[PDB]
Symmetry: C2
Amino acid sequence: KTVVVTTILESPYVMMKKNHEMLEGNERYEGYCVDLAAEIAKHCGFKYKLTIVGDGKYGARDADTKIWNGMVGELVYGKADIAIAPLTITLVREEVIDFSKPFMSLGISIMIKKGTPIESAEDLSKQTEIAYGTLDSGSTKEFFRRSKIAVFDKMWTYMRSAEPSVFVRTTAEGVARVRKSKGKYAYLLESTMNEYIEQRKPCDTMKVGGNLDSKGYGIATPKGSSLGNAVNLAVLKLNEQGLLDKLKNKWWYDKGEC
Amino acid sequence: KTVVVTTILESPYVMMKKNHEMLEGNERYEGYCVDLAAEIAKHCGFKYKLTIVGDGKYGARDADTKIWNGMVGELVYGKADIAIAPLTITLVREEVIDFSKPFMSLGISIMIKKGTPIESAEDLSKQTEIAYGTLDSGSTKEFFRRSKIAVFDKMWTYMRSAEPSVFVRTTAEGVARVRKSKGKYAYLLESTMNEYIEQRKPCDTMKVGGNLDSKGYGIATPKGSSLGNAVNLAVLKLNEQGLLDKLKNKWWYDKGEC
Ligand SMILES: CCc1sc(C(=O)O)c(-c2ccc(-c3c(C(=O)O)sc(CC)c3C#N)cc2)c1C#N
Ligand SMILES: N[C@@H](CCC(=O)O)C(=O)O
Ligand SMILES: N[C@@H](CCC(=O)O)C(=O)O
Ligand SMILES: [Zn+2]
Ligand SMILES: [Zn+2]
């Protein structure tokens, strides 16, 4: 059967083509994950349909309802067959879905408006003037919620209680907030997205300091799926054949505007 | 059943303690993988015995007999239950053993004696004054053997035919060759090992250039091992608790002496 792929509109992973209204099906979209999906499909020998996740979220479990939302929910509830997206491999997710070996490494990082007097997480934690926050429903928020590290625990205590809310619905919303806030908001997001935006006009943001953690994005499938083995082997093959490095360069740096 | 762990004497992952002569069993050893094994053993609820791989190799398949050597062989032939080592996750290996999600990232890199006029793989490939090689029976050799990237293809043509042989039996041999060759030998090895050595007396080596690729080390088990699921889940747990980061700091830069 045609494989339903869940993914997310997150630049430069998946983006609407300029002329998408004139195009159909998989041809409407472009990006790193669009190129990657085509290759995974070709190597595993399946036909597929790209679908954008309905609720626009990565995936988290409701503490009260126990229901998973986002791409993770679409796999868990059988709405999609595979997720090919910047979907972070985490323990709580690996308990309900399967991940390939990672196709990209990343860590949480700090985005500032250029000139913001912050160099580190410690810096953010030791001051009050500059607000800071995360994507409201992903792995970055969870990192802080769970961290027993002093600096990060202090940051979480501030973020969970800050008013108005320092959390954002989408990555684009976080980036826009840094850009419009005259240095008074810094955004905590994955190094991959941080480094992409740093190379986009109007070239007014910067990644500062080291990454806070180390993790990976993986291709996810419902637990027990017949696709998992082949998908994993394809990721390894594509890495070893240099495709992943090629795709990174194509979408990050070949298209740099700064 | 006490779990037989295969591993390899490779700094700073597994090393004999200074006073190892007076110690028995697992107590003889220390290092990142020693600490990791103890942590994994704790979470998965098993007792274990650390055993150094008999042939001192990571693992490769003989093209003629198709027999695997090294730690990979120990798993394949049922001589060990798990490998907890700086064992590179590769397609050919994944076809015969199982790997956890990676516990560490690395890439191939260049070690020179300080002052060697080499900045990149491209620099190495464009001269013959300075010899260069890799470890036998590991993933770095295979990388060059298979590469279609012009620079790396050219380097392999040289390496495979070079006389006397540029290949070494152990990392320690490669490092010693760099240190004694007065700038006329450069060694190709994983960034992790390169960066450790750079921070050790006599402080006469350097990592130069970027990494040539991006991959990871995983904990390996025989295909269909019951330990596989649990060990994978343990690695992710350790990562998120910051324990892996803690271990990396403990063994690389807390032990820095340069
Ligand atoms: C326990 C969770 C952690 S920790 C950690 C780390 O960097 O320490 C990583 C990590 C992420 C990615 C790579 C990697 C590749 C790339 O860096 O692009 S490529 C490729 C083969 C396909 C990779 C593997 N294996 C390696 C390690 C990780 C995960 N997942
Ligand atoms: N990649 C993250 C989303 C981005 C973030 O949390 O910063 C996830 O899978 O949840
Ligand atoms: N980590 C490598 C060994 C070292 C190397 O090849 O540079 C392996 O698993 O084969
Ligand atoms: Zn523990
Ligand atoms: Zn032979």
